[PDB]
Ligand binder design. Structure first.
Ligand SMILES: [Zn+2]
Lengths: 54, 45, 56, 138, 49, 103
RNA sequence: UUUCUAAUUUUUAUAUAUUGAAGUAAUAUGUAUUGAAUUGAAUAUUAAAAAUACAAAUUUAAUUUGUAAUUAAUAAAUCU
C-alpha cells in the first residue's frame, strides 16, 4: 500500500475509498480495488519503541 | 534564578561607612577629613 | 541626518477606493462553505434533495 | 514561546508609549483659542495666595529679553527641559485638575512643548498665546 | 441493602460504560450540555426510538 | 444553557404558532360554525355524490397562516449572499486586470 | 588554583483526536453543436447561450437506471 509520503497527499479515488485510523496512522481503505487504490500515511510502525524508531 | 533584579544600590551598603566615618565631624560643621588613605599605609598591629 | 517618517493623516487610514484587490481568488466562504460559516439551525440552506425537499 | 510567560502587553506592544495620540490633541488645543479670560482664570490662579506660577514660556533667551514677561514670576523653561523630562520635579501634582499654559515665540514651539507635557501625563493645556499674556500684563 | 459507598469523587475518573476509552463515563459539563442539547432537538441524522 | 441552545430550534416556531392561536381565536373563531359533526357528514355526502363541493382557499382566507418562513428566508439569504460572491469575481478579475494599467 | 569556608547557570520541560453527514426523488430546450463507427453532463475540443437550479465524475459499446446532494461537531482554555 503506497505510503503517500505526507498525510496531506491522501485522496479518495473511489466511492468506496474512505479514511481509517489504522493504529494512529490515517490511511485509506477500499473494499473495491482492495490494494489497488489503498494509501497509508507515513508514520512509525504500529509497534515501535523509543530506541528503535525514536 | 541567576538574573537577579534588585536595586544595585543595595550591593554597596553604606550602613557602616557613612560620611561620619571619613569626615568624623560633619554634624559638627567643621568638616575635618580623617580618611584611611591606603591599605599600604597600615602602620601595624 | 535625514530621518524618514510618515506624513500626517488628512483622510481615512485604510484605503477604500484605492484598495488593491485582495490577491487570493475570491471564492467566498459561502460559495464553497469550506469553514468559518455559522447558520441558524432553522435556516439551514440547500438540502434540495436531502431535507429541503420536505421543508419543515 | 513568549506571550505565554509575558503578557500580551509584550511582543504586541508598541513600546512607543510616547506620542501616538497626544501630539494630535496638542494640535487640537492649538486650534481653539486663548485670550484675556483664559488668562484671567489663570489670574485667579495667581490670585490664589498659593503662588505656583501657572503659565510658562518656552522661548529663546534673546527673545525674552526683547519682550520680558517674567513679571508674575512665571516659569522660564528651555523647551528641552520640558521635552527631556527634567522639569517634572517642578510640575503640579494634580495631573487631571491642573492646566498651566505654554507661551512660546512662534506657536509651533508652544504646541511642540505642550505635546511634551501631555506625554508626561498632563491633560488640560490650551498651549499658547505669546501676545495675550502681555495684554494680560498680570 | 442500605450500604452506600461514601465517596466524594469516583475512585476511577476514566472508567468507561461502553467498550472504548472514548466511550468514557464522566463527561465535561461543557460537553454534557452539548449532549443534552442534541438528544432534545430534531434528530435528522440518527433515528430515535 | 440547555434550554437556551434548544430554543434555537423551537421558540421561533413557537413564537409563530403562538401568534396564529391568537389570530385564530380572535378573527375566525367567532364566525365558526360549531356544528362540525353535521358539516363533515355533509361532505361525506357530497363525496357519495362525487359532484361535491371541495372548495379551494383564497389568499385572504389563507393569509391567516402567513408567517416568517425560514424555508425561504434562510435560503435566499444565502443565494443573495452568494450572488455577491459571484459578483466579486467579475469585479475582481476587472480589478486585477486593472492593476496592469500604468499609474 | 595557598588551606578552611561561603555561591546566583538544574545530563525534569507540555507530543493533535469528536464526525465509514451516504434516507427524504418520474419525466420536460437537450440525446446541444461540431469531431466522430458509436458518445446522450462523465470519448476527443469546446465552453461565459439558456430557462422552470445541480455539464470539471463513477457507470454503459451507447443511454436509462444507480452512487452523490455546497454543515453543528470550537484541542484554543499555558500549565505550574
Ligand atoms: Zn478506489
Amino acid at each position: 500500500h503506497p505510503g503517500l509520503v505526507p498525510r496531506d497527499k491522501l485522496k479518495l479515488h473511489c466511492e468506496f475509498c474512505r479514511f481509517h485510523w489504522v493504529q494512529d496512522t490515517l490511511v485509506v481503505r477500499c473494499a473495491a480495488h482492495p490494494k489497488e487504490h489503498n494509501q497509508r500515511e507515513i508514520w512509525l510502525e504500529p509497534t515501535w519503541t523509543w530506541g528503535k524508531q525514536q | 534564578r541567576y538574573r537577579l533584579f534588585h536595586p544595585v544600590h543595595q550591593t554597596v551598603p553604606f550602613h557602616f561607612n557613612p560620611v561620619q566615618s571619613i569626615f568624623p565631624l560633619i554634624y559638627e560643621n567643621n568638616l575635618l577629613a580623617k580618611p584611611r588613605l591606603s591599605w599600604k599605609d597600615y602602620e601595624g598591629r | 541626518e535625514r530621518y524618514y517618517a510618515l506624513p500626517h493623516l488628512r483622510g481615512p487610514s485604510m484605503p477604500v477606493q484605492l484598495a488593491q484587490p485582495s490577491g487570493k481568488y475570491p471564492s467566498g466562504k459561502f460559495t464553497q462553505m469550506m469553514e468559518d460559516v455559522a447558520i441558524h439551525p432553522l435556516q439551514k440552506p440547500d438540502a434540495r434533495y436531502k431535507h429541503n425537499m420536505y421543508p419543515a | 514561546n513568549l506571550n505565554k510567560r509575558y503578557g500580551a502587553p509584550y511582543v504586541a506592544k508598541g513600546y512607543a508609549s510616547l506620542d501616538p495620540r497626544c501630539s494630535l490633541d496638542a494640535y487640537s488645543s492649538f486650534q481653539q483659542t486663548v485670550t484675556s479670560a483664559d488668562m484671567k482664570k489663570a489670574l485667579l490662579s495667581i490670585d490664589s495666595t498659593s503662588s505656583g506660577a501657572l503659565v510658562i514660556d518656552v522661548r529663546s533667551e534673546p527673545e525674552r529679553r526683547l519682550r520680558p514677561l517674567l513679571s508674575p514670576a512665571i516659569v522660564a523653561l528651555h523647551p528641552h527641559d520640558i521635552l527631556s523630562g527634567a522639569a517634572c520635579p517642578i510640575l503640579p501634582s494634580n495631573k487631571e485638575r491642573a492646566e498651566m499654559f505654554v507661551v512660546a515665540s512662534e506657536a509651533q514651539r508652544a504646541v511642540n512643548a505642550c505635546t511634551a507635557l501631555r506625554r508626561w501625563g498632563f491633560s488640560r493645556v490650551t498651549a499658547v498665546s505669546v501676545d495675550a499674556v502681555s495684554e494680560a500684563i498680570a | 441493602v442500605n450500604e452506600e459507598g461514601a465517596k466524594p469523587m469516583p475512585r476511577d475518573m476514566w472508567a468507561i460504560w461502553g467498550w472504548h476509552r472514548s466511550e468514557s463515563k464522566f463527561i465535561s459539563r461543557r460537553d454534557l450540555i452539548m449532549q443534552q442539547v442534541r438528544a432534545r432537538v430534531h434528530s435528522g441524522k440518527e433515528l430515535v426510538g | 444553557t440547555i434550554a437556551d441552545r434548544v430554543r434555537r430550534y423551537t421558540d421561533i416556531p413557537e413564537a409563530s404558532t403562538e401568534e396564529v392561536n391568537q389570530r385564530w381565536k380572535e378573527h375566525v373563531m367567532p364566525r365558526l360554525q360549531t356544528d362540525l359533526e353535521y358539516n363533515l357528514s355533509h361532505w361525506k355526502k357530497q363525496h357519495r355524490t362525487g359532484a361535491g363541493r371541495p372548495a379551494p382557499p383564497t389568499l385572504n382566507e389563507y393569509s391567516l397562516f402567513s408567517v416568517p418562513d425560514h424555508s425561504s428566508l434562510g435560503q435566499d439569504a444565502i443565494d443573495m449572499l452568494r450572488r455577491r460572491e459571484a459578483q466579486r469575481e467579475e469585479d475582481w478579475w476587472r480589478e486585477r486586470k486593472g492593476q496592469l494599467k500604468p499609474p
